[PDB]
Design a protein around this ligand. Structure first.
Ligand SMILES: [Mg+2]
Ligand SMILES: [Mg+2]
Ligand SMILES: [Mg+2]
Ligand SMILES: [Mg+2]
Ligand SMILES: [Mg+2]
Ligand SMILES: [Mg+2]
Ligand SMILES: [Mg+2]
Ligand SMILES: [Mg+2]
Ligand SMILES: [Mg+2]
Ligand SMILES: [Mg+2]
Ligand SMILES: [Mg+2]
Ligand SMILES: [Mg+2]
Ligand SMILES: [Mg+2]
Ligand SMILES: [Mg+2]
Ligand SMILES: [Mg+2]
Ligand SMILES: [Mg+2]
Ligand SMILES: [Mg+2]
Ligand SMILES: [Mg+2]
Ligand SMILES: [Mg+2]
Ligand SMILES: [Mg+2]
Ligand SMILES: [Mg+2]
Ligand SMILES: [Mg+2]
Ligand SMILES: [Mg+2]
Ligand SMILES: [Mg+2]
Ligand SMILES: [Mg+2]
Ligand SMILES: [Mg+2]
Ligand SMILES: [Mg+2]
Ligand SMILES: [Mg+2]
Ligand SMILES: [Mg+2]
Ligand SMILES: [Mg+2]
Ligand SMILES: [Mg+2]
Ligand SMILES: [Mg+2]
Ligand SMILES: [Mg+2]
Ligand SMILES: [Mg+2]
Ligand SMILES: [Mg+2]
Ligand SMILES: [Mg+2]
Ligand SMILES: [Mg+2]
Ligand SMILES: [Mg+2]
Lengths: 79, 87, 66, 204
RNA sequence: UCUGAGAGUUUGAUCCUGGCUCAGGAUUAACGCUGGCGGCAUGCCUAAUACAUGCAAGUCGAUCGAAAGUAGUAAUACUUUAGAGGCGAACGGGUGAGUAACACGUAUCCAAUCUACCUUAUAAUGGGGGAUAACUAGUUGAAAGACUAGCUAAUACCGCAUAAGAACUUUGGUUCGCAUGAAUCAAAGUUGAAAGGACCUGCAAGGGUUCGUUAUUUGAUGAGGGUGCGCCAUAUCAGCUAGUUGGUGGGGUAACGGCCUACCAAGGCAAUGACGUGUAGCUAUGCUGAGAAGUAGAAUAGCCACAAUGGGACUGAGACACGGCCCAUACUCCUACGGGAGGCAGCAGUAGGGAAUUUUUCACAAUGAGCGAAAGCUUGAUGGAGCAAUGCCGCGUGAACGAUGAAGGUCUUUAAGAUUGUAAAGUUCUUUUAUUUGGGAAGAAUGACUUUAGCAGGUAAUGGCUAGAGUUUGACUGUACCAUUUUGAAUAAGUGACGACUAACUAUGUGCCAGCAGUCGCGGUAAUACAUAGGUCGCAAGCGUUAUCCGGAUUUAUUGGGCGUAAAGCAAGCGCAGGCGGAUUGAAAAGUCUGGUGUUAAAGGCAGCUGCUUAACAGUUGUAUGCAUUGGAAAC
């Protein structure tokens, strides 16, 4: 009633979830730090984490694009 | 991922094929997009009334043939026209 | 087999019904008795066939004399 | 699959298989409807349904046909161009076992069917076993060779008595057929055209 | 060029209104009687009831460590796979429970989207690091396993250098749009890649083919959203809706959006039917009809929804995942009593329900899929073979000769006679079927692979491209079919009806009793209507009965009916909305007509043709209907 392919796939996705969750948490904490003490310096780091995650697929590419566009709007308004 | 392939529409102990452009994930004997031409396992000669028109369009578009599908193209000579048009 | 009680005529001369028995009813409508609208298929399950019949047997259910 | 009392049914309708062999007979020269109730009154005034059904049986008993086969052929001929009153007559007379009897190679029609079923007949370029093939004038329906020697070939080879619509090239037993049968070769046993309308009501 | 049949029945008799019944087709059919075979097709309509047991998605050693086996003195050579990794498991298969609405059909706009592999084109594929499966050891157990500590490998993972082009912004131009708004720059800033494997050559260095990878580009397929129109019954369901209607800023989604959020408001739908109830998967189509249309949504094909019930999420290009994961409920089962296991609406099959619907089968041989360079491999999809007269089609139970009449049966026109009846008996003949003998295919009139020949690119080598040779492969299968092969009519006829509609009548028995019946109606001691018999008629390997749909039924009448006396004019009036509506002129062109283009999936429908011995059937070409857009016509 069980298939080795299905069992193996479940065992792999646990490890993938751990790694991807770590990457996603760094982006979350980084954008919150940025918008906390606003500073053009942070912005760069935001670009790096979002683009890297988008390539790997972890995050949908559109979400990175909207986050990128919207974060840059705050800087122009504040500068 | 259009794939020129066959579709059985004969009867018991008598197959009958039709060359047709269809997607890979569509079931055999289901829905398709364009008609190329029919086939008969026992037509002796001219067993594959080919079209020679849209088939070149779909192959140029990137259609992937099959082993038996390719075979038919070669005796008539359709493989030659496709490869020389690529060149 | 449902929950409907219907008065069904036993079509034939002589019956083995014993107040408690099983029958395989069919369609019909006897014109003499008001309310009866069904007929019992003869010679099928518990109900016996109609012997001593050589004419139109296929309907009453009797084994070919042979 | 057929009746084994052809005298009885021919005596009832009144018309035999066109030689009166089943009417003359060697006894009593009986021309009355069979059964005890044959010499009675109430002869004429058959209803339109009555005469139509009697006539319909005449057409389909002259050739040994089942009514369902008749309905198939009528459905076939019905659709084409128009007043096809010349086609279905050719269609009804195109039966393979019927042609062998008109060929003059069989003593009787249903005996010819038996020879057809047993494989003693051939066709232009193939062999035929089923006694229902619809023929078309032009096929060289050549006879068998091992059946020309059987202890019943004598009357079979006496095809000099033959209808003009079955040309044989006598003594060569080629046995083709052209010049489709006119109504003259289809005698007054069944020569009517409201049987077509009878099947028009019953068969679409 | 379409194209339509009626009859019986109220009365003493007639005409009309009017209801009932019948003559014809059809089905996923069932029952009774009977029963030989072949070619096609169909086969749980009920309990989306519960399921024993066995199968239904894997593949790559040419990604990687290790292990094992066989040879070898060794170095090593070959084979195999538990595990890591890639890819596929979201396709394919089944069922129709739910669903009355953008579910579906049709036409569309996505200036509001995604798309892995595949197509074209264009830059790169350099260099480091840290880990863990397998293994070892220990604890805990019968085992499943689980926990703990060390050891390793990469196309697993994580940094770094580098951007042809990318993404996000900045500067002003361009071309503009349908309101938000898109389109193109030149300059600049900011941000961001990966991995190698197989083989050949080369002393080496280096070079090369191919697979694969990252970043892009072109399309296409597939997925998603919105909108117009069409798409059940019911008023003996009149109000419904408080994220419901709108704006603002923000969040989220592939994307627009009360999808979500805080604030500000009070709207939205509804008699042209909201809301509620009941019912149902929708469509192409099947049956019926002259047609308009009625009816069921068999099989199959498109789309949607579901996977014991109800929720949530990971992985991924794509799932909120039939035979993946987590939780709860219900149910069953195992245990050594601590713990666990389970989802046949996948192929068979079992139990149960039912009037009722099949092998616990063979092979991937052909077609199709997934992985692989190939070898291959996996395929209850698929192709066959069983089963069943379930439906359509076809063939058989014999042929000739044979009594102005064998026997028997039934009537006797009380000797005669008829009738069954050329039927039989009897003489000859044949073997589709049936039983031996010999031959023996079609599908594989494909093929992938491997040695050769030639071309062809690049060339220093190898792969791709055609031809020939080979391994060439069958579940059906010693099957269809064939032959002068032995025997031989031998192995094969039932069912309904006979008063009228409706083709076909006599006797015996019974005596308003027993019984028949689709309708009128038969039976009260002379029954062609009951029972039996003889005869005869209608069908035939089928025949009747029952159930359902359509026609006939102009019997809900748009085509195509009526309201004085037969059903039907409200008791009458004032009357909004609705329907209809005098004459002439002008414009527009919503109806109306017509031309062009797109589409209306394939199968089916009708016509022609081909192939099965012809047919049934299969294939083949033709064949409309509607919608949208555009260009004209101006009579109503
Ligand atoms: Mg993702
Ligand atoms: Mg009367
Ligand atoms: Mg009828
Ligand atoms: Mg392995
Ligand atoms: Mg799965
Ligand atoms: Mg699925
Ligand atoms: Mg199927
Ligand atoms: Mg079902
Ligand atoms: Mg992929
Ligand atoms: Mg490494
Ligand atoms: Mg970097
Ligand atoms: Mg990598
Ligand atoms: Mg708003
Ligand atoms: Mg339902
Ligand atoms: Mg009509
Ligand atoms: Mg269906
Ligand atoms: Mg169904
Ligand atoms: Mg399952
Ligand atoms: Mg099953
Ligand atoms: Mg289930
Ligand atoms: Mg296969
Ligand atoms: Mg049948
Ligand atoms: Mg038949
Ligand atoms: Mg005889
Ligand atoms: Mg006698
Ligand atoms: Mg072969
Ligand atoms: Mg009776
Ligand atoms: Mg009687
Ligand atoms: Mg009717
Ligand atoms: Mg009507
Ligand atoms: Mg009227
Ligand atoms: Mg009145
Ligand atoms: Mg009045
Ligand atoms: Mg009144
Ligand atoms: Mg008024
Ligand atoms: Mg008004
Ligand atoms: Mg179509
Ligand atoms: Mg067909």
């Amino acid at each position: 009633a069980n298939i080795k392919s299905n069992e193996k796939r479940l065992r792999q996705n646990i490890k993938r979830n751990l790694n991807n969750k770590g990457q996603k948490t760094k982006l979350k904490t980084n954008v919150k730090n940025f918008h906390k003490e606003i500073n053009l310096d942070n912005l760069g780091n935001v670009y790096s984490q979002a683009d890297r995650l988008a390539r790997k697929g972890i995050i949908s590419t559109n979400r990175a694009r909207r986050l990128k566009s919207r974060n840059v709007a705050v800087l122009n308004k504040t500068q | 991922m259009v794939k020129i392939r066959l579709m059985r529409m004969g009867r018991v102990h008598y197959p009958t094929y039709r060359i047709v452009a269809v997607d890979s994930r569509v079931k055999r004997d289901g829905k398709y997009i364009a008609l190329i031409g029919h086939l008969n396992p026992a037509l002796k000669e001219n067993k594959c009334k080919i079209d020679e028109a849209v088939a070149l369009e779909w192959l140029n578009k990137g259609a992937k043939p099959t082993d038996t599908v390719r075979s038919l193209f070669s005796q008539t000579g359709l493989w030659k026209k496709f490869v020389e048009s690529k060149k | 087999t449902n929950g409907f009680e219907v008065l069904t005529y036993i079509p034939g001369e002589g019956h083995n019904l014993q107040e408690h028995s099983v029958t395989l009813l069919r369609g019909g409508r006897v014109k003499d008795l008001p309310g009866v609208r069904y007929h019992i298929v003869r010679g099928t399950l518990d109900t016996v066939g109609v012997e001593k019949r050589r004419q139109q047997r296929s309907a009453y259910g009797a084994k070919k004399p042979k | 699959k057929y009746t084994g009392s052809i005298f009885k049914r021919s005596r009832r309708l009144g018309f035999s298989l066109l030689e009166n062999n089943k009417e003359f007979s060697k006894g009593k020269k009986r021309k009355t409807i069979p059964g005890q109730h044959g010499n009675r009154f109430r002869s004429s005034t058959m209803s339109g349904y009555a005469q139509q059904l009697q006539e319909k049986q005449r057409m389909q008993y002259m050739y040994g046909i089942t009514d369902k086969q008749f309905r198939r052929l009528f459905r076939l001929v019905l659709k084409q161009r128009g007043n096809l009153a010349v086609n279905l007559f050719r269609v009804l007379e195109s039966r393979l076992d019927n042609i062998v009897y008109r060929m003059g190679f069989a003593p009787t029609r249903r005996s010819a069917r038996q020879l057809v079923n047993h494989g003693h007949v051939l066709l232009n370029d193939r062999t035929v076993d089923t006694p229902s093939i619809i023929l078309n004038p032009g096929d060289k329906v050549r006879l068998k060779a091992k059946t020309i020697k059987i202890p019943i070939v004598k009357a079979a080879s006496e095809s000099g008595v033959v209808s003009p619509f079955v040309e044989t090239n006598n003594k060569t037993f080629e046995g083709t057929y052209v010049r489709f049968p006119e109504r003259s070769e289809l005698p007054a046993g069944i020569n009517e055209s409201y049987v077509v309308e009878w099947y028009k009501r019953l068969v679409k």
